[PDB]
């Protein structure tokens, strides 16, 4: 899956 | 905010 | 699954 | 914000 | 923000 | 998956 740390 | 379409 | 830390 | 389309 | 189309 | 650190 994707990981987005905004 | 962030947008994650997995 | 995806991980979003906003 | 960031956009991630995985 | 960044845009990542994976 | 992709990793976006924004
Ligand atoms: Zn993953
Ligand atoms: Zn936003
Ligand atoms: Zn996952
Ligand atoms: Zn943005
Ligand atoms: Zn931008
Ligand atoms: Zn990966």
From Swiss-Prot, chains A, B, C, D, E, F:
Protein function: (Microbial infection) Forms amyloid beta-sheet fibrils in semen. These fibrils, termed SEVI (semen-derived enhancer of viral infection) capture HIV virions, attach them to target cells and enhance infection. SEVI amyloid fibrils are degraded by polyphenol epigallocatechin-3-gallate (EGCG), a constituent of green tea. Target cell attachment and enhancement of HIV infection is inhibited by surfen. Also similarly boosts XMRV (xenotropic murine leukemia virus-related virus) infection.
Protein name, UniProt field: PAPf39
Organism: Homo sapiens
Range of the intact protein held here: 260 to 265 of 386
């Amino acid at each position: 899956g994707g990981v987005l740390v905004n």
